[PDB]
Structures are given as structure tokens and as C-alpha cells.
Amino acid sequence: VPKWIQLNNEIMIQKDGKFQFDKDKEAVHSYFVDYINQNTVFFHNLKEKLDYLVENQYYEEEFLSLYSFEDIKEVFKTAYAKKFRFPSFMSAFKFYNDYALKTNDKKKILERYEDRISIVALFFANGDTEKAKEYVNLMINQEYQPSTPTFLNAGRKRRGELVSCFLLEVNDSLNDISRAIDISMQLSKLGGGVSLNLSKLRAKGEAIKDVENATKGVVGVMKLLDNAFRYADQMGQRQGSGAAYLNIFHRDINDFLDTKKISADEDVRVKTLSIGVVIPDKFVELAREDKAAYVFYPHTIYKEYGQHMDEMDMNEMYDKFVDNPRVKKEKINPRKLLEKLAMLRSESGYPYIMFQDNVNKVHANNHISKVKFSNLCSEVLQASQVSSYTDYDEEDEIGLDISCNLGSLNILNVMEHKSIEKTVKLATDSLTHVSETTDIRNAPAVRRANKAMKSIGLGAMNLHGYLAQNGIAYESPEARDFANTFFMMVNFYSIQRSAEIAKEKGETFDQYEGSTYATGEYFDKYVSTDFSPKYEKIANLFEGMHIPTTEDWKKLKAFVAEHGMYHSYRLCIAPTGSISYVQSSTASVMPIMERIEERTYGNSKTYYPMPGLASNNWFFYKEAYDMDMFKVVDMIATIQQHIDQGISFTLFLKDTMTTRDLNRIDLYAHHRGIKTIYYARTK
Amino acid sequence: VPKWIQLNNEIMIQKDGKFQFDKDKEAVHSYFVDYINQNTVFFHNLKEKLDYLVENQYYEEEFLSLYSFEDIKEVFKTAYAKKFRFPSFMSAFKFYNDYALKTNDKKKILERYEDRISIVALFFANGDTEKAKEYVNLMINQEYQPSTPTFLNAGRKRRGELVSCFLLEVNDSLNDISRAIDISMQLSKLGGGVSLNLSKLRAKGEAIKDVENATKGVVGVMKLLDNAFRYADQMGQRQGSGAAYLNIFHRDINDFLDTKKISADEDVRVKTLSIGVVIPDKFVELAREDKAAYVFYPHTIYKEYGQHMDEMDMNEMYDKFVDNPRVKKEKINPRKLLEKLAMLRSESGYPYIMFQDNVNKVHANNHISKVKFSNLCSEVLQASQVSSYTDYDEEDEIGLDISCNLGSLNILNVMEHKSIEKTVKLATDSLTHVSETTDIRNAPAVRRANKAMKSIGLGAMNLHGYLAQNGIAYESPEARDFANTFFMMVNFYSIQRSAEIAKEKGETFDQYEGSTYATGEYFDKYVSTDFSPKYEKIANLFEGMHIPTTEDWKKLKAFVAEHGMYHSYRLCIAPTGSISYVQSSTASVMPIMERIEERTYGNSKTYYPMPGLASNNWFFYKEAYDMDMFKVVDMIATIQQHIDQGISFTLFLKDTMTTRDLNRIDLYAHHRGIKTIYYARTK
Amino acid sequence: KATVEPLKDDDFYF
Amino acid sequence: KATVEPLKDDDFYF
Ligand SMILES: Nc1ncnc2c1ncn2[C@@H]1O[C@H](COP(=O)(O)OP(=O)(O)OP(=O)(O)O)[C@@H](O)[C@H]1O
Ligand SMILES: Nc1ncnc2c1ncn2[C@@H]1O[C@H](COP(=O)(O)OP(=O)(O)OP(=O)(O)O)[C@@H](O)[C@H]1O
Ligand SMILES: Cc1cn([C@H]2C[C@H](O)[C@@H](COP(=O)(O)OP(=O)(O)OP(=O)(O)O)O2)c(=O)[nH]c1=O
Ligand SMILES: Cc1cn([C@H]2C[C@H](O)[C@@H](COP(=O)(O)OP(=O)(O)OP(=O)(O)O)O2)c(=O)[nH]c1=O
Ligand SMILES: Nc1nc2c(ncn2[C@@H]2O[C@H](COP(=O)(O)OP(=O)(O)O)[C@@H](O)[C@H]2O)c(=O)[nH]1
Ligand SMILES: Nc1nc2c(ncn2[C@@H]2O[C@H](COP(=O)(O)OP(=O)(O)O)[C@@H](O)[C@H]2O)c(=O)[nH]1
Ligand SMILES: [Mg+2]
Ligand SMILES: [Mg+2]
């Protein structure tokens, strides 16, 4: 066993009844003085390194050609001047195993952390040396972290796409279904997770040109998509991951759910395609009143009204659907469907739950379209217009397929540096650059939506780490007050940066004029309610930083009205799975699953303590499963009130609790304004 | 139990030690006295019937509008003047259960046999009343039978395409694979059987964008195609049928074959995807000499030579591939592979066998392309060019995808009427009309090849029936002499009609000038070898009909040289599954499987004796399984020497014979010039 | 397989 | 499954 592995395992060997956390630090030293420094490839100077990486097809020469070599040297020197040290063995291990650039045979390390950060910063700046240095200081301080696609692939010749998630709308036609399969394979080839809205597809037993009981429903398309994602599996490196979203009022909703039952037959079971359920407020109202509900056949509704079932408001059209004899429907028990959802989530963590009305009551771009589904991580909530893919030799009507670039603020590092504004603006600029340089030649709706919406996702990580390292319980009202203030600041500065970009470029996102940003409605709660901390401890935490007041929000509203906004969507809190290790941060705004996690790599086992875990903050690092899910819902709703898109909200459940407890948590989340629920992980 | 069913089951009841065959005739009467006439919709006049069928979206207005009502009435009167009577119960049952037009509620019969024949004739003639009457006389004499798609759908508004055999070339790209899946779905939606060539696809463990061991091989594409064919199943009417063809020198050939093993796992086996193997002469030579063969990785060959492995002659390329270090390959035992093919055919009848050099040594259009694969029934053998389907908003390079037009001569009815020439020419005209009226807007290469090649397939059936009713054993040399003469006349008149159509329209098929028809090579064996019958009995059978001599063939060769040929391909012998029942004929040129076949419809049993079966010809109606497969191969080769495309050749094996016997039959078929082997049906 | 417990109403109100 | 015999060199000639 390696020396650093032994040093890392020495953490759990208690000395005087206490964990040896400091041993972890020793491990990193070993991991660098025995493996990383020996396996790294050193050159005489930076010029030889850059030339070797350029000619050997490791780096794209275009982004490096925008800078003179003196500027690149200055950027690299700025990166290395911080003398960044990984505080834990797992941070360095995760970076150098998942994100550091290696040779073709993967026998040596070509990129250090500073080298990777410098390359990403140079790609972000697009020829601006000072902006490149700003990005270097932002990332080496670990205030901001580009998503895994962006961080891993920026400036690389053999790179994939920098966009993490893609959302596709599938129209009710064989041509559209085949095009959706093709686009899903193309985007999984690019490495991104693909989510498809199957609510427009007509249910099983519908008519295909006057011959009835002919359609296979959404389950056949689900099987096709599952096979497509199995085939396109990132060249066999990462398993192809897809998501299917269906409205709960679709007739196939049961069969949909039956795809995830552990007793499902092979002709129905789907195993590589995640499932999500979109629940309007009408379904929750029907379940609450115990009135038997009706699931609908989408094609009959489309024939009668000319619009898809998910294209209009069910809260106002459900009674018309039920009373219309030309609309076909089936009777269901909404409470039984809710119990089935809870049972399925207990068994397998599926489906994702999207509370459609919670998303669309604060959605700023309802004029473009209502949010009808979410992404594979159930945090992207954007307007999408379905595409009309016609026959060959016929022009296709290209709609809008959602796609946003992810980037997470490290809350602990951002607040320690007292740089919410600067970090938010620089992250917004980097995400705008990632969107601008993204061009997908096989997904037309994705390309058009990227060009028009200009949507970005600016997330946050290390919420629980910051709270525990500052002596604040994650479930405490003080933690929710901190989240309220911090994310109001993040939203304020993201809106300010979006408006500044719109002013400097003279262009807003498409159809901005009909948005609530243009009408000033979006700023209502910000121009009447003060989001400054209500607790003295939180206010002290925010000292040295100008917390925006109602007057600052009014000025920002006037600025947006004058100049507009460049981005339709700005903030989305992704799970941030593996890149949180490199940043020494807790995953997303979720509470920690465990204080020390035991992970098996190769034939060895390693223990990763939570960042900053110690004796004095052991009980502040409360495990998520031991927490009250209602208070976690309260925290997520408090954050969500300042996030325009959704938050990947994973439920952490105990084995003792029943499906009724899961249903109660889901209904409280819906009551509190939670937009989406990601996973039901049971301990 | 209905009266006609009792009268049909009375056949097996033996009187005086003989089957009551004549009772079947009585059954037909009952089937018309009790059921057909009662449930047949009658109108006061044909005008009312046509108006009701057109208005209720049963027929098409366009083809009926080309004639005055007097001409349509005259065509119907010509059809009804024959007073055609079905000789067996199963003929009428199959027609009125599969082909007769029924109401939307499927309880009444709108079309009789004469009505359907008149409608198909009017569709064929395209406005010529005399031509329509000629077609009506052709089909009511049952000399020619349009295929199930043409016969069932001609003149019907609610219909699929008139072509059901489609051959697709799949290029080695994700765009091309997705387009192939889409086109397969669209053509299965039209009701057609789709065959895909997978030899150009790179094998498992090949490189995608210079990353190693990334390709899933052809088995993943087969899984995708199998899911696509399961999804597209004629609006839930018939099981989606597809075929995949792989060259035996393709690296995946074993895994390909492993998709049909019973022991194969769920992620390996494809259930609704037929498989065929293309066997070049090089593989047979390697197996014969017991030299170990090599299966090559197609992408390495493409990178080294710039052409696909299946696009070059393996006979001259195999040594260069083996000696090339940059071409990747694995060692295999060709005899072990042949034994595996025989074992798989014994287990399930798969794969289809295509002898590439047997097809291409007589292929007239090798300049366009060599025949690389066959159809789902393994009888369509045509030149195909792969298409380069690029990314979106980029122009595709449309190639040639095979789609030939099926139609079968009834050898018994044709020869008893002494009308080989007239029937062949009228069938060629009808096939040309159906090919010209076919327009598929979702298969670009299929449409382009239909417009350019103008390929049709004119088949034959009732060969064994005709031989048995004339006191000729199917395995006798007299039967082969008759087949030689009859199919040489069929080829002569098909070529004459093609040249006449080319002269009339002033156009030939695309790239005809490079064909062996233009150079006169095709007629070589016809201008030197006399194909007149060598037996007096066969000559007396051909009495009253002019048998083309060598001088007639020289005149036809000169005529083709002067005027060209309209069809790239003219003759292909399809299995003729259900139309053989309606025509009271034995299926294809195959020998009969059973003298009397027992079938179960609903909860009732039915008995179909072979047409013309009696005590006198009971011995001549020898069952296929009891026959020597070498003599069946000899007869099929005798026919194949006059057929430009292939013949659906099913092997009929006993359970006693081993895989060595199957391999011997396959090798004798290869030796005798058999182009394709369809199925290995074990009794 | 978590214990299936029916929704008892008043679980929709908070 | 069906009985399996190996292919002899004489089965390749007719
Ligand atoms: N935790 C760590 N994170 C990142 N790099 C590290 C870490 N530990 C060691 N290294 C790398 O290995 C080298 C070993 O040097 P070490 O940290 O032991 O101190 P040093 O030789 O006194 O110099 P310096 O600390 O100034 O780099 C470091 O210079 C650095 O490049
Ligand atoms: N074997 C058969 N094949 C086809 N149709 C038949 C057959 N037997 C009876 N029919 C149908 O039933 C009708 C009655 O025929 P039947 O044998 O009673 O005498 P017919 O002289 O042919 O009668 P009709 O006055 O109807 O011409 C036929 O006209 C025909 O429509
Ligand atoms: C994308 C993808 C392709 N393939 C197969 C199918 C294709 O025939 C082959 C790659 O075809 P292409 O998609 O054309 O590969 P490429 O153009 O990206 O790179 P290159 O042309 O240099 O190979 O690999 C997979 O098996 N899995 C996959 O996920
Ligand atoms: C062709 C086909 C369609 N379908 C379903 C899936 C599609 O969402 C739906 C629409 O198919 P379409 O492609 O729209 O079929 P169509 O346009 O010919 O019929 P219509 O005019 O009624 O739209 O039919 C199947 O389930 N199986 C099939 O084989
Ligand atoms: N020398 C060297 N520097 C590197 C390499 N990779 C990254 N760097 C960094 O890039 C910057 C360039 O410095 P360098 O050219 O080596 O300075 P010089 O030695 O005075 O020429 C330094 O701050 C290094 O930390 C490498 O392979 N070799
Ligand atoms: N009357 C009638 N004739 C039909 C029908 N279907 C096909 N036919 C045929 O179409 C032809 C039309 O002739 P018809 O209108 O009956 O003129 P008629 O013989 O003087 O009474 C006839 O020869 C019929 O055999 C039908 O439903 N009604
Ligand atoms: Mg449609
Ligand atoms: Mg390619």
C-alpha cells in the first residue's frame, strides 16, 4: 500500500479518543512527494511545455494564440504565486485522477492544478491578460469553480463540450422521435447529460392516422432512448445518462413509473434513463381533496384544442378536459399516484419531482414558454419551445431546447474573501464566454436556444461547510438567514452583471421585452422586502461587504429597464458531485451525507473527512440523514426564492420512515415553493 | 363450428382409403353461401359503390379520375365475366381475411376478388381502359399476381407503400447510424421490410476520434435497430421485421452470429432483427484449404486504403490486408466459422447466406457497385452506394438504397394459357408503373435509387404445383429442363419489355452505359447456348409458344444495344407467402413443405391440400423435407442462371442430418452458383 | 421496500 | 441443438 494511503487511513485510528484529522494533511504531502512530483512532466520553461502541449494535440492553439507568450507566462506566474496547497489528500487525488491532463498513455501528469487553472483562465479571458489574471486569482483562491465539463475540457484539443446538461423537447411524431434519439446520441457523444420531455408524445392506445390503439406510448420511446443512451456512452468511459420527463396528467404516467419498478419486465424496464415527473398544482389539489383525478390522452387534446396538453395551464384547463367528450381520459386516484411516487422513490430514488406551478409562478420568461420539465439533475428550469422536425427535403421548424453552462461559487471562500460581487460578476462573465464559444452542429434547437436565450447556470457549493465551520447549524434559522442574504446578494450581482453585459454588447436575450425583468415585476419582492440578515451573527459574517438594500434593488431595476438583461437565466444550483472534492467543499447547498466518507479506489480504501471537520465543529457537521427534512426544505426554499432556475434538492431519508413520510416531505416542499426534488437517498 | 369448416375438415376423413379432396370445393361453396355473400356489402350499381368507397376514404380519387365511369364499369364487367371461382376454401379465406377491403368496423366485406382485381388493374393502367382490361384478364386468369403490398394497397387511400423490400447502406458514423435507424422506422411505418448493411460499420474495440477501444461494434447498432423495428410495427398490426447483413470477413462476425444464439444474454440477443452473412469466395477458399482466416477491423482498412472493406474485392485484397501492419485483424478458423453458421441455421434458421462472388460474377451493374448484401427475404441482389449523412445544416451525400418492386408469375396458369410473353410484359409494365408511382419522402437514398435504377422484381410461383400436376418430379432432370427453358423465356421477354420501355420513354436506368447489357456481355451465354428443352415432354409442355433461340437472343442483344434497358434489375423470386394461397399456388419456386397443411385460425382447425393434389399426383407432390437438397440446389441454380437478382432459397432439412450435411448443402450451393440461401427449416 | 403507509389527510396542510 | 460433425476436406469438392 502507498505511504499516502496509510497516512490517510491513519485518520480513523483514534488517538486519545479523537480522530487524527491532521494526518490527512500529511497524506497530501506524501501524495505529492512520492507520486505527483515524480509522475509530473517538467520542462525547461513554460515555452517548451506550451509547445509540447500544442503540437501533440493536447491544447487548442487558437485560444493560446490570442496572448503573447509574455502574457501567458504572467498568467501562469500569477497562478503559481498563490502557492496553492491541497488541504486534503482526496482533493488532490480527485483533481489528478479526474481533471489533471495526462499523456496519451496516461502514464504521466502534464497539468498541475495551477496549469489547469491558468489554461481555463486564458480560455475564459479570450485575449485579455488582466481578465485572465482575474480568473486565475478567482480560481486559485477557489472562490469560483467552473463545472466539470468546463474545468476539464477548456483549452483542450481532445475536449468534448463545455455544456453539462441538455434539455430536449420531443414533438408527437415519428420524425421528431427519431430526431430526438439522434440528438440524444450526439449530445451523449459530446459528454453531456440529455433530458427529454415526453409529455407531448401521445399515450399508449392512441391513433396514428385514423387507425386506433396503435401507439406504443411513451414507454416505447423510453426504450428507444434507453438503447440510444446505452450506445452513446462517451466512448465507453462514462455510462450514457439520460432523463425522461413526463407530466403527471399524461395517461402513460403509471407505465412511465412502471419503468423504474424493481419487478418490471424486461420489455418495460428501463435502466440507464432517469425518470422525472412534472406535477402541476392541480394534481396536488386533487390529491389533497381526495377527488379522483383524470389522466389524459395528449393526442385527443391536441386534436380538440390545437395545442399540446403540457403547452397550456392544467389549473385552468383540467375541468374543460374532463367535461369535453372529445378528449379521452382515464380515471386515477391522485393519492394512490402520490403513494406510488413515494414508494418508487424509496425503492430507487426515482422519479424526479418537478412542481410545475412552483416553477412557473416565479418564472421570468413565461411569455416565451412555461417550464414543462427539468434536466438530468433536476435543477435547470427554463422555457423551451418544441421543434417541428419534418420529413426529409422539408424545412424543419427549429424550436428552443434548453442548455446552460454550470459554474459554482465556493461560499466559504467567497465569504472569506468578502468578494460576493467580484466573484459573481467574474463567474457570470466566464459562463457567458462558455455559452458564446459553444456551437453544437448536430442539435439545432440546442444551438438556437444557446444563441438566443444566452442562459447560464451559476451555482454555489460549500454552504454546509461554511455554516459548520462558522458554528451555525444547517437547520437553524440563522443558517436560513445567511442563505437568504447570501443568495439575494448573488442574485443582485448576477442581475447587475447581466445588465452590464447587455449594455456593453447592446443586445439582450431573445424575447426579453416580454419577460418580468423588462416589466419590473421580477424585482417586486426585492423593492419591497429587505433581505439583510436578521441575526447579529450573520450580519457580522457579512461585515466588510455592502449588502444590497431596497434602494440598491430599485436602482438595479431601473438599470435593467434601461439596458435589459443579457441572460434569460443566470442561477442554477447543480449537484456539483466530483468537482466539490477539488475545491475542498461540501457538495452543492445540500447538507453533508456523512462526516467522513469511506471510498474504495483500486484495491485500497480512503477516508475523506468533510472540509474543516474537527472536534469543535463535529456536531455542526450534522449528517443529512439525521436532519429534519422539513428544515432542509425550508433552507432550499429560502435559497430558491433567489434562484431563477431550480436547485438539485436531494432528499435524505432514514430506513425507518415510511412512504407517508416521503409524501409529507414532498407536499411540504410543494407548499414551501420548492421547484424540483432530485433524489430520495435512503440510508 | 361453421359448415364450411366442417366441410374442409372432412378432407382428412378418408373414404375408400383416399382423402376427400373434392369436399374442399364444397367448402368453398359453403364459405360463399353462408358467410361471404351474407357479409358482402352490395350496391344498386357500381357508380354507388365507387362513390361510397371514394367518399368514405377507402379509395383514392386520383387513379379513378383518370377514367370515365363507362371505362371503369367496362373493366369491372371484364373482371366479372370470367366468373372466377376459388378452387379451395383456403384461397377464398386468405383473400377475404387478408386482402379484401373491409369496412372501418371490420364486419362487412366491401371488395370481392373481381372488385380488388379491377381496382388494381385500373391503378396499373394509369388511364388506359384497354390496358386496364388487359391487366384484369391477366389477374383474373391468375397468370400474374402483384405482391401483397401492391395487391392489398393499390387504389386504397388508407394504405402503406406498395414496396415492402428496402435495402439500406449504413456508413460508419453516428450521424449515418441515427439516420439509418430513422429510415428503418419510417419504412417499417410504411409497412416495408428493411434490410441494413452493417459491414461498413467499424467493429468493437475500434477508435472514435483517435481514442482507443471506444466502438461498441455492429452489435450495439443491431440492438438499436432491433428496438427501432420493435417500436415501428405497422401501427401495432404486424411485428416489425428487419434484417442486418454483415460480411463474414468483418471482425464482429462472431458477435453478430452470437446475437442469434439461445444462450446469448439479453444485452446481446436481438429478437426481431434477422441476420444475414455475406460470404465472399475468399472465405470459402480459406475454409476449403483449411488455412486460418483473418477477420479485419473495417476502420483500419478504411484509414489505410480510403475505402471500406466491403467496397473492394476481398479476393485480391485479402493478402494485402493480411500483410499490411496498419490493418488490424484477428485469426479465426474458417471451418469453425462454417460449422458455427450451420449450427446456428439448425437452431434458428439464421443467418441468411449471401455468396458474394456468385452474385457478382453475373451482376450486370458492377460498375455502379457490387452487390454487398441482400434483403430481408434474401432474394434482392442489386448495386447499392452508401450515403454520407452529415451533421445538421450540412448537405448530405445521397447514395443508392435498394427498393425493388415485387410481382410473381403463376407458372401453371401462365403456361397453360401459353402466354409467357404477354404475362411477362404486362407484369413488367405494372411493376414499372408501381415503381414510378412510389415516392418515399423520408428515405432519400431509397427514393433516389428508385428514380435512377428503376429496378423491379418479377418473380414466379407454382413451379412445384405445375410440375406435379404435369407428372414431373421436382428433383427430376425434366423439371430442371423445364425451369431452364421457362425462366430463359421469362428473362428474354423481361429484357425485351425493358428495352421496349426504354425506347418508348427514351430513357434507360442511370449508369446503364457501363452495364453488361450495354456492352452485350450479359447476352453472351444467350447468344452461344441454346436453352430449348432437351426432353420431349418439356417441349410438348412448351407447345404453342415460341421458344427464343440464339438468333432471337442476338436480335434482343442488338435491340438492347440500340435502345438500352429501362430497368437495372427485372427478375427476383420472392417467397410469396400469402398470395400463393389466393392464387391457389405453391409458394415461390420452392418445393412444397407438406402435401396437406393443417392451420389453426381462432379456435378452429382448417386443412389446405396443395393445389391440384389428388391420388394420381400424390407421389409427384413430394414434400420438400423428403427431397434431396442437392437436387433442389440444382433446380434453384438452373433458375438462377436466368434471374438477374437472387431467389429466396429455403433449405428443408430433417432432424436426423447433422451440421455437416447443412454445410455440405451450403458448399454445393456455392459451387453450383447459388446466390443466396434463405432459411434452414428443420422438420 | 419502505413500509407503505397511506396518506391520512392533513398531510396536505401545514 | 443439432448433432455436429466437423467438415472434411472432401465436403468442399463436388
Ligand atoms: N498539499 C500540497 N498541495 C499541492 N502541492 C503540494 C502539496 N504538498 C506538496 N506539494 C508540491 O510538492 C512540493 C514539495 O515541497 P514542500 O511543500 O514539501 O515544501 P518546500 O520544498 O519547502 O517548498 P514550497 O512549500 O515553497 O513549495 C511543493 O513545492 C509543491 O509543488
Ligand atoms: N367457389 C366459389 N368461388 C367464388 N365465388 C363463389 C364460389 N361459389 C359461390 N360463389 C359466389 O356465390 C355465388 C353463387 O354461386 P352458385 O354456385 O350458387 O351459382 P352461380 O350460377 O355461379 O350463381 P350466380 O347467379 O350468383 O352467378 C356466385 O355468383 C359467387 O358470387
Ligand atoms: C459516437 C459513437 C460512435 N460509435 C461508433 C459508431 C461509428 O461508426 C463510429 C464512429 O463514427 P463517427 O461518429 O463518425 O466518429 P467521429 O466522426 O466522431 O470520429 P472518427 O470519424 O475519427 O471515427 O463509432 C460508438 O460505438 N459509440 C458511440 O458513442
Ligand atoms: C409510426 C409510429 C408512430 N407511433 C406514435 C409515436 C408518435 O408520437 C405518434 C405520431 O406519429 P406520426 O409520425 O406523427 O404519424 P403520422 O403523422 O403519420 O400520424 P398523425 O397524422 O396522426 O400524426 O405515433 C408509434 O407509437 N409507433 C409507430 O410505429
Ligand atoms: N519551468 C517550467 N515552468 C512551468 C511549467 N509548467 C508551469 N510552469 C509555470 O509557469 C511559469 C513560467 O515560468 P518560467 O518560464 O519557468 O520562468 P523562467 O524559469 O524564469 O524562464 C512559472 O511560474 C511556472 O510555475 C514547466 O513545465 N516548466
Ligand atoms: N350492382 C353492383 N355491381 C357491382 C358491385 N360491385 C361490383 N360490381 C360489378 O360492376 C359492374 C357494374 O355493372 P352494373 O352497374 O351492375 O350495370 P348492370 O349490369 O346493367 O346492372 C357489374 O358487372 C358488377 O359485376 C356492386 O356493389 N353492385
Ligand atoms: Mg404527426
Ligand atoms: Mg466519422
For the record, the C-alpha cell of A290 comes out as: 381526495
Q: Is the Cβ–Cβ distance between B310 and B280 less than 8 Å?
A: no
Nearest to D3 among B287, B658, B663 (CB): B658
- Among protein residues, the one whose CA lies closest to atom 14 of ligand 4: A173
For the record, the C-alpha cell of B119 comes out as: 381496382
What are residue A276's DSSP bridge partners? A245, A352
One-letter amino acid at B49 equals K
Q: Is A117 exposed, middle or buried (0-12, 13-18, 19+ CB in 10 A)?
A: buried
What's the CA gap between A278 and A323, in Å, rounded?
23
For the record, the C-alpha cell of B520 comes out as: 452485350
> B157 CA distance to ligand 2 centroid (A)?
29
Residue with cell 396437406: B596
Q: How was this structure determined?
A: cryo-EM
Please list every residue in chain A whose beta carbon sits closer than 8 Å to the beta carbon of residue C4. Answer: 339, 343, 658-659
| A374-408 burial: b if 16+ Cβ within 10 Å, else e | bbbbbbbbbbbbbbbbbebeeebebbbbbbbbbbb
CB contact under 8 A, B216 and A224: no
What's the CA gap between A78 and A68, in Å, rounded?
16
Measuring CA to CA, how many Å separate B167 from each of A616, A654, B123, B192, B382? Answer: 73, 56, 26, 10, 9
Q: Is the Cβ–Cβ distance between A472 and A482 less than 8 Å?
A: yes
One-letter amino acid at B627 equals M
> A536 CA distance to ligand 8 centroid (A)?
62
For the record, the C-alpha cell of B398 comes out as: 445521397
Give the distance from CA A466 to its chain's centroid. 20
What's the CA gap between B346 and B340, in Å, rounded?
10
What's the CA gap between B60 and B42, in Å, rounded?
20
For the record, the C-alpha cell of B501 comes out as: 420501355
Residue A379 assigned ligand-binding role: yes
Q: Is the Cβ–Cβ distance between B292 and B213 less than 8 Å?
A: no
For the record, the C-alpha cell of B671 comes out as: 459451387
For the record, the C-alpha cell of B436 comes out as: 414510378
A203: left (phi over 0), alpha (psi -120 to 50) or beta: beta
For the record, the C-alpha cell of B308 comes out as: 471500406
Give long-range contacts, CB 8 A cutoff, 24+ apart: B213-220. B213/A236, B214/A235, B214/A236, B215/B299, B216/A231, B216/A233, B216/A236, B217/B251, B217/B252, B217/B255, B218/B244, B218/B246, B218/B250, B218/B252, B218/B255, B218/B256, B219/B252, B219/B255, B219/B256, B219/B258, B219/B259, B219/B268, B220/A230, B220/A231
Which residues, 6 or more positions from B151, have their beta carbon under 8 angstroms from its beta carbon?
A: B99, B116, B120, B145, B579, B582
CB contact under 8 A, A290 and C2: no
Q: Which residues line ligand 4 at a C-beta cut-off of 6 Å?
A: A 172-175, 177, 201-202, 208-209, 215-216, 220; B 189, 231-233
Nearest to D7 among B335, B346, B682 (CB): B335
For the record, the C-alpha cell of A98 comes out as: 479526474
Q: Is B101 exposed, middle or buried (0-12, 13-18, 19+ CB in 10 A)?
A: buried
Ligand 1: does its nearest atom lie under 6 Å from the Cβ of A29?
yes
CB contact under 8 A, C7 and A335: yes
Question: Alpha helices, DSSP H only, in A574-616?
Answer: 579-582
Nearest to B658 among D2, D12, D14 (CB): D2
For the record, the C-alpha cell of B208 comes out as: 472514435
Measuring CA to CA, how many Å separate A215 from each of A34, A203, A234, A327, B181? Answer: 62, 7, 31, 17, 18
Report the 10 Å Cβ neighbour count for A33.
12
Which residue of the set A9, A171, A247, A375 is catalytic? A375
- Note the ligand closest to the C-alpha atom of A303: 4
Angle at A600 between CA A594 and CA A603, to 5 degrees: 160
Angle at C5 between CA C1 and CA C6, to 5 degrees: 135
What's the CA gap between B161 and B147, in Å, rounded?
12
Report the 10 Å Cβ neighbour count for A585.
29
B351 preceded by a cis bond (ω within 30 of 0): yes
Identify the helix (H) or strand (E) that includes residue B74.
helix B69-81
Q: Is the Cβ–Cβ distance between A172 and A298 less than 8 Å?
A: yes
CA atoms within 13 A of residue A593's CA, in its CB half-sphere = 17
> B209 CA distance to ligand 8 centroid (A)?
8
For the record, the C-alpha cell of A543 comes out as: 461585515
Which residues, 6 or more positions from A189, have their beta carbon under 8 angstroms from its beta carbon?
A: A232, A234, A235, B174
Instruction: Give the mutation target among A177, A198, A208 for probing the ligand 4 site: most ligand atoms within 8 A of CB.
Output: A208
Chains D and B touch (3+ CB pairs under 8 A): yes
Identify the helix (H) or strand (E) that includes residue B681.
strand B680-682
Please give the full DSSP string across A141-187, using - where no structure is assigned: TTSEEE-HHHHHHTTBTT---S--EEEEE--SSHHHHHHHHHHHHHH
One-letter amino acid at A338 equals L
Q: Which are the catalytic amino acids of B?
A: 375, 377, 379
What's the CA gap between B488 and B493, in Å, rounded?
9
Please give the full DSSP string across A610-635, using - where no structure is assigned: PTT--STTTTTS--GGGS-HHHHHHH
Q: Is the Cβ–Cβ distance between B649 and B683 less than 8 Å?
A: no
- CA-based nearest residue to B671, from B615, B630, B610: B630
Q: Is A603 exposed, middle or buried (0-12, 13-18, 19+ CB in 10 A)?
A: exposed
CB contact under 8 A, A660 and C6: yes
A298 preceded by a cis bond (ω within 30 of 0): no
- CA-based nearest residue to B268, from B219, B226, B221: B219
- CA-based nearest residue to B407, from B232, B574, B539: B574
Strands (E), A440-595: 456-461
Residue with cell 477458399: B285
CA-A220 nearest atom, ligand 4: 26
- Tell me if residue B676 falls in helix, strand or coil: strand
Angle between helices B281-288 and B314-323 (to 10 degrees): 70
Dihedral angle computed from the Cα positions of residues A55, A61, A64 and A69, in that order, rounded to the nearest 10 degrees? 40
Residue with cell 434536466: A375
One-letter amino acid at A634 equals D
Give the distance from CA A247 to its chain's centroid. 21
SS (H, E, C) B426-446: HHHHHHHHHHHCCCCCCCHHH
What's the CA gap between B173 and A637, in Å, rounded?
46
Which residues, 6 or more positions from B69, have their beta carbon under 8 angstroms from its beta carbon?
A: B46, B47, B50
Residue A377 assigned ligand-binding role: yes
> A648 CA distance to ligand 7 centroid (A)?
35
Local structure of residue B102 (DSSP, 8 states)? B
Q: Is the Cβ–Cβ distance between B23 and B11 less than 8 Å?
A: yes
For the record, the C-alpha cell of A537 comes out as: 451573527
Identify the helix (H) or strand (E) that includes residue B558.
helix B550-563
Which backbone phi and psi does A607 adopt, to 5 degrees? -120, 125
The residue among A269, A442, A448, A451 with the most chain B CBs within 10 A of its CB, best to mutate, is A442
Could you give all domains of chain A from N- to C-terminal order, each with its CATH number?
A: 3-142 (no CATH), 143-280+334-683 (3.20.70.20), 281-333 (no CATH)
Which residue of the set A377, A404, A410, A450 is catalytic? A377
One-letter amino acid at D6 equals P
| B433-471 burial: b if 16+ Cβ within 10 Å, else e | bbbeebebebbbbbbbbbeebbbbbbbbbbbbbbbbbbe
Report the 10 Å Cβ neighbour count for A366.
16
Q: Is the Cβ–Cβ distance between B327 and B296 less than 8 Å?
A: yes
What are residue A459's DSSP bridge partners? A408
Residue B579 assigned ligand-binding role: yes
- C8: nearest CA in chain A? A660
User: Taking ligand 7, which is a single-atom ion, which protein residues have CB atoms under 5 Å away?
Assistant: A 173
Please list every residue in chain D whose beta carbon sits closer than 8 Å to the beta carbon of residue B659. Answer: 2-5
Which backbone phi and psi does A128 adopt, to 5 degrees? -100, 110
Please give the full DSSP string across A100-139, using - where no structure is assigned: S-B-TTS-SB---HHHHHHHHHHHHHTS-HHHHHHHHHHH
Ligand 3: does its nearest atom lie under 6 Å from the Cβ of A230?
no
Angle at A665 between CA A659 and CA A671, to 5 degrees: 135
Angle at B48 between CA B42 and CA B54, to 5 degrees: 105
Identify the helix (H) or strand (E) that includes residue B496.
helix B477-505
CA atoms within 13 A of residue B348's CA, in its CB half-sphere = 21
Residue with cell 475564459: A124
- Tell me if residue B47 falls in helix, strand or coil: helix
Identify the helix (H) or strand (E) that includes residue B330.
strand B329-332
CA-B80 nearest atom, ligand 6: 25
One-letter amino acid at A324 equals N
Residue with cell 385500373: B122
- CA-based nearest residue to B50, from B68, B34, B30: B68
Residue with cell 455440405: B664
- Note the ligand closest to the C-alpha atom of A204: 4
For the record, the C-alpha cell of A505 comes out as: 454588447
> A127 CA distance to ligand 5 centroid (A)?
20
CB contact under 8 A, B392 and A441: yes
Identify the helix (H) or strand (E) that includes residue A496.
helix A477-505
- Tell me if residue B294 falls in helix, strand or coil: strand
Q: Which residues line ligand 2 at a C-beta cut-off of 6 Å?
A: B 28-29, 32, 37, 85-86, 92
For the record, the C-alpha cell of B452 comes out as: 435512377
Residue B623 assigned ligand-binding role: no
- Tell me if residue A281 falls in helix, strand or coil: helix
Residues on chain B bordering chain D, Cβ-to-Cβ distance under 8 angstroms: 284, 287-288, 290, 335, 338-339, 343, 346-347, 655, 658-660, 663-664, 667-668, 671, 682
Please give the full DSSP string across A505-538, using - where no structure is assigned: HT---TT-TTSHHHHT-TTHHHHHS--S-SSHHH
- Tell me if residue A600 falls in helix, strand or coil: strand
What's the CA gap between B343 and B349, in Å, rounded?
9
- Tell me if residue A215 falls in helix, strand or coil: coil
- Tell me if residue A74 falls in helix, strand or coil: helix
- Among protein residues, the one whose CA lies closest to atom 15 of ligand 6: B45
Residue A375 a catalytic site member = yes
Q: Is A40 exposed, middle or buried (0-12, 13-18, 19+ CB in 10 A)?
A: middle
What are residue A651's DSSP bridge partners? A680
What's the CA gap between A503 and A558, in Å, rounded?
13
- Note the ligand closest to the C-alpha atom of A24: 1
Give the distance from CA A316 to its chain's centroid. 31
Bridging pattern class, strands B457-461 and B406-410: parallel
